[PDB]
Amino acid sequence: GIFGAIAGFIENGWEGMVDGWYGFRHQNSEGRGQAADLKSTQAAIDQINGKLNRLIGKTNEKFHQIEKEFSEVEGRIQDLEKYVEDTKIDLWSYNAELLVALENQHTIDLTDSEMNKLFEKTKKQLRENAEDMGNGCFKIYHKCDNACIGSIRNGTYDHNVYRDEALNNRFQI
Amino acid sequence: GIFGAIAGFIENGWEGMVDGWYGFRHQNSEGRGQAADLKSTQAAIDQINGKLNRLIGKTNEKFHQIEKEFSEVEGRIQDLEKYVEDTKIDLWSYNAELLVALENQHTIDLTDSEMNKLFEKTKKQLRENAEDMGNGCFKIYHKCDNACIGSIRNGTYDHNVYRDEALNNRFQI
Amino acid sequence: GIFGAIAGFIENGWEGMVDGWYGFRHQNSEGRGQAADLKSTQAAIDQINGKLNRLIGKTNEKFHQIEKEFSEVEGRIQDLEKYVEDTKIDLWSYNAELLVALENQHTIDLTDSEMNKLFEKTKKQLRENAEDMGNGCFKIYHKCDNACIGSIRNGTYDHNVYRDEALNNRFQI
Amino acid sequence: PGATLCLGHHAVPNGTIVKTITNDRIEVTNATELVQNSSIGEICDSPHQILDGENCTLIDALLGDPQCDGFQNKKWDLFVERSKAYSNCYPYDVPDYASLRSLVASSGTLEFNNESFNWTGVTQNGTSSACIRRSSSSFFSRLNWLTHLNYKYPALNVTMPNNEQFDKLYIWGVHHPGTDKDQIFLYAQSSGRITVSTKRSQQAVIPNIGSRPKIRDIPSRISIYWTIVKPGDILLINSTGNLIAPRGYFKIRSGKSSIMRSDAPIGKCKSECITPNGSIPNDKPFQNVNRITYGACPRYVKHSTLKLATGMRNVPE
Amino acid sequence: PGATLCLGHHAVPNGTIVKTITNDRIEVTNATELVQNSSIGEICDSPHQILDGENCTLIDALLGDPQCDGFQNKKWDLFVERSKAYSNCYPYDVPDYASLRSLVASSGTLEFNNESFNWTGVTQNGTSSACIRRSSSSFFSRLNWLTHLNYKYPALNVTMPNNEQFDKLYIWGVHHPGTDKDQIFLYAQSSGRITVSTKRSQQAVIPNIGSRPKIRDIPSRISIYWTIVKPGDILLINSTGNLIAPRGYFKIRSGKSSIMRSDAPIGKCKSECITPNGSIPNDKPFQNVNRITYGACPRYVKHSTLKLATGMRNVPE
Amino acid sequence: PGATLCLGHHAVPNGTIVKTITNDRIEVTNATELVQNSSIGEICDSPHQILDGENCTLIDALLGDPQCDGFQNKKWDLFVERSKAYSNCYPYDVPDYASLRSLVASSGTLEFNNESFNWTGVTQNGTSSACIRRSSSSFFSRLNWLTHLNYKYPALNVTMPNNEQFDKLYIWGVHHPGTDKDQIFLYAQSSGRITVSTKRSQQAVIPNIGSRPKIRDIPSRISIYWTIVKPGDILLINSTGNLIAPRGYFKIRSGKSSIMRSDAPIGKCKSECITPNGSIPNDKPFQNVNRITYGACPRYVKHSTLKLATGMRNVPE
Numbered sequence A, B, C: 001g002i003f004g005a006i007a008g009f010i011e012n013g014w015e016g017m018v019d020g021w022y023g024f025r026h027q028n029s030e031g032r033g034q035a036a037d038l039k040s041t042q043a044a045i046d047q048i049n050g051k052l053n054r055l056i057g058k059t060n061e062k063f064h065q066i067e068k069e070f071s072e073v074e075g076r077i078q079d080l081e082k083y084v085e086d087t088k089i090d091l092w093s094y095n096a097e098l099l100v101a102l103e104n105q106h107t108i109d110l111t112d113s114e115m116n117k118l119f120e121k122t123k124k125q126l127r128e129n130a131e132d133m134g135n136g137c138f139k140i141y142h143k144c145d146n147a148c149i150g151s152i153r154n155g156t157y158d159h160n161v162y163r164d165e166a167l168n169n170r171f172q173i
Numbered sequence D, E, F: 001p002g003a004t005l006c007l008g009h010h011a012v013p014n015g016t017i018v019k020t021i022t023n024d025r026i027e028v029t030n031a032t033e034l035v036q037n038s039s040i041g042e043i044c045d046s047p048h049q050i051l052d053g054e055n056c057t058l059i060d061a062l063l064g065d066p067q068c069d070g071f072q073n074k075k076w077d078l079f080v081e082r083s084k085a086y087s088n089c090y091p092y093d094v095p096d097y098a099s100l101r102s103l104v105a106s107s108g109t110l111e112f113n114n115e116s117f118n119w120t121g122v123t124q125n126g127t128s129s130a131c132i133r134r135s136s137s138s139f140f141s142r143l144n145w146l147t148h149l150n151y152k153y154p155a156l157n158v159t160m161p162n163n164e165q166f167d168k169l170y171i172w173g174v175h176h177p178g179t180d181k182d183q184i185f186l187y188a189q190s191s192g193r194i195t196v197s198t199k200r201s202q203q204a205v206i207p208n209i210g211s212r213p214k215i216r217d218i219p220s221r222i223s224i225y226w227t228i229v230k231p232g233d234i235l236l237i238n239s240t241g242n243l244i245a246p247r248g249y250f251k252i253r254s255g256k257s258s259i260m261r262s263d264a265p266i267g268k269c270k271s272e273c274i275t276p277n278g279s280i281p282n283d284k285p286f287q288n289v290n291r292i293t294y295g296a297c298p299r300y301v302k303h304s305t306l307k308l309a310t311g312m313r314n315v316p317e
């Protein structure tokens, strides 16, 4: 994808994450765990549902048209009726195939985008208290129990509480 | 947007910024102020004007065509004339609606992109002298008067002048 | 481009890089040199070849059609044959021009993307041992001989080997 | 010790392959098909009013072939013509048959109003053993075969004004006898002429005498013509022989009706979209079932499958 | 103390809603309409040369109906036919009327050159009270009604070579008398024949005698035909009666001319794009005013509005 | 001291200008042309089977104009009609010429099977000095000009059943004599009639006597008609004079064959795509050579060039 997160610096997806599309796995003094991020999941789902709202259940009514099958050879007028229909079908077939290829490229990029946005947001929350290990994981340089992890996932982590502890551990030797 | 700046980590836009599309607000020892960034504003405007150059004032001349309204029932040939026209209109109507949806998606993404590019450029200028607060703002860890702010906006800020001062303040306790 | 690397924070391209599309130039205690990055080059080439596979060598067979040139004035049926053909040509001409403009915009963005991805990956590898100078270059704060540079290009650089040395140099005075 | 916090995304064990601009085959977590590729094999009789033609073409129901008497004055949104249909009356043809079929199909109605033309001097109601109705020699129900009376066929010059607020559709014909002798037996003179006109149109036909291959023992033929008469206009019929006269007019309407050739059975179900294969669901935007459609239908394309990704790239461990 | 430096973007109090690929309603700072939805209600008389048909159809101006004499030899880029137009000459029809109208409209000219056919043995210049010119019985200006001379109509066999460098368009007709008696009064014999030919084409017509509804007391009709004669070719007219002769030829050209049905008034203004509603601006790429257009026009679409974003997402406080 | 590590991308000295959504002119490292703008100027004779018409139109090869005898029973994927082609037999026309040309072109074959009609009572094999074959007066090879025998032309009533498993295409005509005297010299009676019919179709033609401009001294004309006879059907020909009889039938097929007007020479080469200009390569998806194409061809567009970027933006020092 164009951001380089999904199938990129995130090595692989998590089959064990079943309650969301994006989320957090942690390891701390109390154990290891997983939690889905609801806002990024919903942002991706909402955009894809916008595409589906454009495409599903939106057909046009047509009634009497031209004939499209013929039992007898006729020449000029029948040649034209067939050419008109073949022309129309080829143009709609082109539209359909291009639409799906374009939309699919965009869907892969927007889902990569949402993964990147969540990563960047988390990175900024941690300020000087953590370092990016390069694979979607942060090494957090302070004791960070379950409530602490939860404060990061919830966007209420106060980096100033832990900064002295974290700087001491980071800039050791 | 796909970069996550506009309607993203930038909480909202500035109705009070009337002389540009992107810009800087600062608070320092001398007060607080605002300045538009001309280069990023122009980059966004130029791209949108490229789209408008493709779309405005570019119509095709057509002269004698087929009839499209009929006062009498005629059957086969009239059915075909009507079907040809209905086919054409539906294909152009599809082109027009898809064009605008695609272009609008892209315009929202390219304007988000220009906001992100300006943020990243500023972040890199500051080197070790500032920290990203996560909301589009930098906490600058040294005295930074109006000329100093102006040197950042102009791309002439010399981070080495302030680095000793800033590192002392950043890595306190 | 939408990431702001190519024609952006990278000032210009390298005419002297002839064995790849993206790569590394270094200066260290042993001299200065250049090396192409094969994976990012191949990622960009593969995507463009995907576009070409869609476009080259994929024509449709058509046989008997309608006449498209006429030696005598005839009126209604000939008007319709000409209008059908003019309609078809204008729709395909629109498809062709839009396809190329869209694809070209995307090709410029995906090649900018691959440059940005390589930059970000390298930045993350260096952890606390280097600083981004803002122009695509990293200032590396430790002695980094040819094998060391090669370990960065190969993705085997062990930042912990050099961290003490680099932190001492970075956070001087 | 500290902690580690890892950011990630889900994956599934059963991903789906889709196409993009840069890749012919890339796996995503989920996708949805945009091309409807099946029908239920029957034409649902709701919401469109379906008229099953059974053994009758629309034109035979119009003229009044005896097996088609059940279709008199019927209406339809979609008339369904079956491949088993056959004619079983006097042999006929229709110059520009396709246009008459189209205009009646689009009108959606066989409502017919009788009119009294007052044919004086001729014999009305000619019949044929090629057109059996109730085990008796008959004729097209809506047509009136006039012949000589007392070996005279005095010239006809008959008016029928349209004093209604709607258009009238008249169906009439010319009889082409097999031989010059038959011409005399029927019309008591050698050369018939027909001139059917309004203020704004004229149609003059000349019978063409000669042998055509016998159908139900008839080497003669009738040729069918039609005339539309606007309100305030007049039908003027002027003939010296060989006229197959109208008995009245058809109401001609405008609307959403049509005709389709299909052998699919009619079912008691609901579906907006009809194809000759049967009704198809119309949730998807495209379909490859049939280029012939009626109703709110997906657009026909030459693709058997177009999968729209509805999830991110699938990246298993 | 230090400083804070915040990066940001503008917003407006009056944003505009647009559609995207992922959102049906998203607010941006500005947008521009791409569908032209109005006309000025008049057809601008520049830059295209407009000919207002007033009471005349193009075909009536061609034949030379007396109310159309002002149109002789006129030229146009766009001929405008009004719904109030009516015919006021001898009753006629044109087989394939639509094609003759189209080919004359596209040619853009009624320039007409008289030719001397030297009709010997017949009476020229027949007239009718159905076609009044200057309070006198007259006829189509470009047509020549020949009748018997001294109760003889000797067969005509007349040549007119095309020795010009351009194509000639000939308009002619056949008279269909109302009765066999009228046939005699006019042509002094019972059966007329017309054969009009060139080296590369032949048209043979037979008059069809009979009553049509009377128009200005005329139960007869004329049927209009046309013939194109290339340089180096010859017009050969061969007739024993019922010929409505040409008086010359029309120049036929190729170019950008056309015809449009409209009741919009003509104005003194400039506009490249004409619709039957009136001229429309052509800055926008699309329009929903009318599918009928002439000139440099936006493309007709079935959308009332398509707003193109010209600014970023609008995010107020 | 430390080190510097710089990330970068290549550039070239000879970049290429392309168009994007936001920029009309932007330079990339490389691009490829998507519009084929040239042909090789000859039609490659592989893989499609080409038949060069030389001096013959397809219709003249069908009827059997003497210069076209080499085309008897030939087959083609593409028949190539040359602008130098000319007719050199009895003057004729074909009502709906374009349709007969189309249906024969699409069938791809002039295979012809003779049939014995057993014309009794008439003289067969009429000839003309307008149609010289081997320095002798002749006639269309596939047509049979019947005239009187002993100043009698007894009425013809001839059957030919289709007992084959394929459709038969019959070509026949009506002779229009220049004068009433010629009508007698040839058919020994004043008024000919032709009625050609099957169970499902009828065609009745009346000759139209009169002078047409002389071609190779002939003021008469033949008009060409055709009839398709399905298996299990019958051809019935009924005529009292003026019949130009068929000598047999053409096989009519369905497939991929067509016809093209071109003056390009035929070459010994291979190319899937044929235009009247010559064959063109078909690697690119679009072309601006000709809207007339045959085979696996790029799509015609009104653009002289469309460059697809195949590299990044080119940013020189």
Ligand SMILES: CC(=O)N[C@@H]1[C@@H](O)[C@H](O[C@@H]2O[C@H](CO)[C@H](O)[C@H](O[C@@H]3O[C@H](CO)[C@@H](O[C@@H]4O[C@H](CO[C@]5(C(=O)O)C[C@H](O)[C@@H](NC(C)=O)[C@H]([C@H](O)[C@H](O)CO)O5)[C@H](O)[C@H](O)[C@H]4O)[C@H](O)[C@H]3NC(C)=O)[C@H]2O)[C@@H](CO)O[C@H]1O
Pocket: D126, D127, D128, D129, D130, D137, D145, D147, D177, D178, D182, D185, D186, D217, D218, D219, D220
């Ligand atoms: C008192 C007296 O002496 N009066 C004189 C009359 O005799 C004479 O009338 C004519 O007499 C001759 C005698 O040889 C002959 O019978 C005439 O009648 C025709 O006969 C032929 C031969 O059989 C017959 O042809 C057959 O037709 C059938 C089909 O039959 C119908 C049908 O279609 O079912 C019967 C229908 O009633 C008739 N329809 C109408 C409206 O009249 C049609 C119609 O004629 C055809 O469909 C047109 O093609 O035919 C079958 O096709 C056989 O194959 C075929 O041989 C004709 O049908 C008979 N014609 C009529 C009109 O009945 C009889 O006219 C009189 C005038 O000559 O002079 C008196 O003085």
Ligand SMILES: CC(=O)N[C@@H]1[C@@H](O)[C@H](O[C@@H]2O[C@H](CO)[C@H](O)[C@H](O[C@@H]3O[C@H](CO)[C@@H](O[C@@H]4O[C@H](CO[C@]5(C(=O)O)C[C@H](O)[C@@H](NC(C)=O)[C@H]([C@H](O)[C@H](O)CO)O5)[C@H](O)[C@H](O)[C@H]4O)[C@H](O)[C@H]3NC(C)=O)[C@H]2O)[C@@H](CO)O[C@H]1O
Pocket: E126, E127, E128, E129, E130, E137, E145, E147, E177, E178, E182, E185, E186, E217, E218, E219, E220
């Ligand atoms: C010295 C002598 O004795 N000479 C003999 C002649 O008498 C005789 O000539 C014929 O005489 C009879 C006598 O009964 C009759 O008058 C013939 O003239 C026709 O008369 C009918 C009846 O009135 C008339 O029909 C009326 O037509 C008008 C319309 O009139 C015009 C028109 O359209 O304005 C008049 C035009 O001049 C005429 N145009 C041309 C080119 O001739 C047309 C044209 O005839 C029609 O438009 C065709 O439909 O008609 C109106 O329609 C009324 O409703 C209708 O009743 C005919 O119009 C008269 N026909 C002509 C040609 O004038 C007269 O010929 C002669 C031959 O029989 O024998 C001599 O010995």
Ligand SMILES: CC(=O)N[C@@H]1[C@@H](O)[C@H](O[C@@H]2O[C@H](CO)[C@H](O)[C@H](O[C@@H]3O[C@H](CO)[C@@H](O[C@@H]4O[C@H](CO[C@]5(C(=O)O)C[C@H](O)[C@@H](NC(C)=O)[C@H]([C@H](O)[C@H](O)CO)O5)[C@H](O)[C@H](O)[C@H]4O)[C@H](O)[C@H]3NC(C)=O)[C@H]2O)[C@@H](CO)O[C@H]1O
Pocket: F126, F127, F128, F129, F130, F137, F145, F147, F177, F178, F182, F185, F186, F217, F218, F219, F220
């Ligand atoms: C023993 C006896 O006395 N018998 C009597 C016969 O004399 C008489 O027959 C008729 O006699 C007259 C005498 O004046 C005349 O010769 C009739 O023959 C026609 O002659 C005209 C005048 O020359 C001629 O017209 C010329 O035609 C040529 C073209 O010639 C051909 C051609 O196309 O090459 C010759 C072909 O054989 C012929 N084709 C067929 C199938 O018959 C065609 C055809 O006639 C035309 O193509 C139709 O347009 O013509 C050229 O066009 C010249 O410009 C033109 O002047 C006719 O062609 C001759 N017609 C025929 C049929 O040959 C002759 O019939 C008999 C009956 O009246 O009575 C006996 O008692």
Ligand SMILES: *[C@@H]1O[C@H](CO)[C@@H](O[C@@H]2O[C@H](CO)[C@@H](O[C@@H]3O[C@H](CO)[C@@H](O)[C@H](O)[C@@H]3O)[C@H](O)[C@H]2NC(C)=O)[C@H](O)[C@H]1NC(C)=O
Pocket: D178, D179, D211, D212, D213, D214, D219, F157, F158, F159, F234, F236
């Ligand atoms: C012109 O020629 C045609 C063809 O020969 C004549 O039509 C044919 O007439 C015969 C005799 O009436 C018909 O025979 C019948 O055939 C059925 C079929 O089984 C048979 O059962 C009957 O007993 C009867 O013999 C034949 O069907 C018919 N053929 C066609 C194709 O119509 C025609 O009569 C001739 N014209 C004139 C005016 O004589």
Ligand SMILES: *[C@@H]1O[C@H](CO)[C@@H](O[C@@H]2O[C@H](CO)[C@@H](O[C@@H]3O[C@H](CO)[C@@H](O)[C@H](O)[C@@H]3O)[C@H](O)[C@H]2NC(C)=O)[C@H](O)[C@H]1NC(C)=O
Pocket: D155, D156, D157, D193, D194, D195, D238, D239, D240, E180, E209, E210, E211
């Ligand atoms: C249309 O209908 C009218 C009815 O008025 C027909 O007009 C009539 O036609 C007949 C047949 O020709 C005329 O009879 C003839 O009378 C003359 C006068 O002596 C005579 O010479 C003929 O031998 C024949 O008997 C009749 O006069 C005439 N008018 C009336 C009032 O009957 C007309 O023929 C019809 N046209 C067509 C094409 O059907």
Ligand SMILES: *[C@@H]1O[C@H](CO)[C@@H](O[C@@H]2O[C@H](CO)[C@@H](O[C@@H]3O[C@H](CO)[C@@H](O)[C@H](O)[C@@H]3O)[C@H](O)[C@H]2NC(C)=O)[C@H](O)[C@H]1NC(C)=O
Pocket: D037, D038, D039, D276, D277, D288, D289, D290
């Ligand atoms: C819906 O109905 C259409 C039309 O009946 C179906 O398409 C038709 O399918 C038949 C059967 O496969 C095709 O017939 C075959 O044609 C080939 C030559 O093309 C021949 O060799 C075989 O012997 C057989 O006759 C027919 O061509 C085809 N017609 C068209 C226009 O596609 C279609 O399959 C049906 N779809 C569904 C979902 O039921």
Ligand SMILES: *[C@@H]1O[C@H](CO)[C@@H](O[C@@H]2O[C@H](CO)[C@@H](O[C@@H]3O[C@H](CO)[C@@H](O)[C@H](O)[C@@H]3O)[C@H](O)[C@H]2NC(C)=O)[C@H](O)[C@H]1NC(C)=O
Pocket: D157, D158, D159, D234, D236, E178, E179, E211, E212, E213, E214, E219
């Ligand atoms: C065949 O029948 C038609 C229809 O009846 C005959 O035409 C009609 O002829 C009458 C008598 O000339 C016309 O009457 C006129 O009507 C006007 C209208 O107000 C009146 O003011 C006059 O004083 C005059 O009485 C009538 O208009 C006309 N109708 C039509 C529809 O044309 C026709 O004459 C018959 N054919 C033959 C050959 O007799």
Ligand SMILES: *[C@@H]1O[C@H](CO)[C@@H](O[C@@H]2O[C@H](CO)[C@@H](O[C@@H]3O[C@H](CO)[C@@H](O)[C@H](O)[C@@H]3O)[C@H](O)[C@H]2NC(C)=O)[C@H](O)[C@H]1NC(C)=O
Pocket: E155, E156, E157, E193, E194, E195, E238, E239, E240, F180, F209, F210, F211
């Ligand atoms: C085309 O124009 C030519 C003019 O040359 C017409 O040919 C002429 O037609 C008339 C009428 O049939 C001929 O008169 C006839 O003469 C014979 C000979 O005795 C006689 O038996 C007839 O009763 C009648 O009087 C004439 O001879 C003939 N040629 C010339 C030089 O006048 C031709 O009829 C026209 N064709 C058409 C369709 O208008």
Ligand SMILES: *[C@@H]1O[C@H](CO)[C@@H](O[C@@H]2O[C@H](CO)[C@@H](O[C@@H]3O[C@H](CO)[C@@H](O)[C@H](O)[C@@H]3O)[C@H](O)[C@H]2NC(C)=O)[C@H](O)[C@H]1NC(C)=O
Pocket: E037, E038, E039, E276, E277, E288, E289, E290
């Ligand atoms: C430009 O002119 C076109 C054509 O005149 C206008 O479209 C037409 O608008 C009229 C008036 O609304 C429509 O008539 C109405 O039709 C309905 C049934 O559809 C009927 O129930 C009403 O009583 C009335 O007759 C007409 O259908 C429509 N025609 C088409 C082809 O759309 C159009 O509105 C004009 N545009 C502008 C901007 O002036």
Ligand SMILES: *[C@@H]1O[C@H](CO)[C@@H](O[C@@H]2O[C@H](CO)[C@@H](O[C@@H]3O[C@H](CO)[C@@H](O)[C@H](O)[C@@H]3O)[C@H](O)[C@H]2NC(C)=O)[C@H](O)[C@H]1NC(C)=O
Pocket: E157, E158, E159, E234, E236, F178, F179, F211, F212, F213, F214, F219
């Ligand atoms: C009806 O009028 C046409 C036109 O005048 C007559 O056709 C013309 O007939 C003459 C005399 O046979 C032809 O003359 C020939 O011209 C060639 C050309 O150089 C000359 O070399 C010969 O020696 C001969 O004199 C002329 O070509 C011909 N014109 C046309 C356009 O066909 C026609 O004969 C008349 N109809 C009747 C029935 O008389």
Ligand SMILES: *[C@@H]1O[C@H](CO)[C@@H](O[C@@H]2O[C@H](CO)[C@@H](O[C@@H]3O[C@H](CO)[C@@H](O)[C@H](O)[C@@H]3O)[C@H](O)[C@H]2NC(C)=O)[C@H](O)[C@H]1NC(C)=O
Pocket: D180, D209, D210, D211, F155, F156, F157, F193, F194, F195, F238, F239, F240
């Ligand atoms: C189609 O072919 C049939 C062949 O059977 C033609 O029928 C025949 O037509 C001739 C010509 O009219 C008839 O001769 C006539 O006989 C009567 C009886 O006396 C006489 O009054 C006439 O003067 C003439 O001589 C013949 O009887 C009739 N039948 C047969 C068995 O020959 C028919 O004419 C052809 N139709 C066409 C349009 O070519």
Ligand SMILES: *[C@@H]1O[C@H](CO)[C@@H](O[C@@H]2O[C@H](CO)[C@@H](O[C@@H]3O[C@H](CO)[C@@H](O)[C@H](O)[C@@H]3O)[C@H](O)[C@H]2NC(C)=O)[C@H](O)[C@H]1NC(C)=O
Pocket: F037, F038, F039, F276, F277, F288, F289, F290
């Ligand atoms: C392939 O063949 C087509 C058709 O022959 C070529 O297009 C034609 O090119 C000729 C020569 O330039 C054009 O003729 C000119 O037309 C103008 C008016 O448009 C006239 O003023 C000149 O005197 C000359 O006659 C012709 O219009 C044009 N036709 C079409 C339909 O485009 C085409 O150039 C050929 N392409 C290649 C690559 O060989």
Ligand SMILES: *[C@@H]1O[C@H](CO)[C@@H](O)[C@H](O)[C@H]1NC(C)=O
Pocket: C052, F030, F031, F032, F310
């Ligand atoms: C430019 O692109 C085309 C299409 O991929 C390729 O064939 C050609 O080799 C490229 N040129 C260079 C110099 O890479």
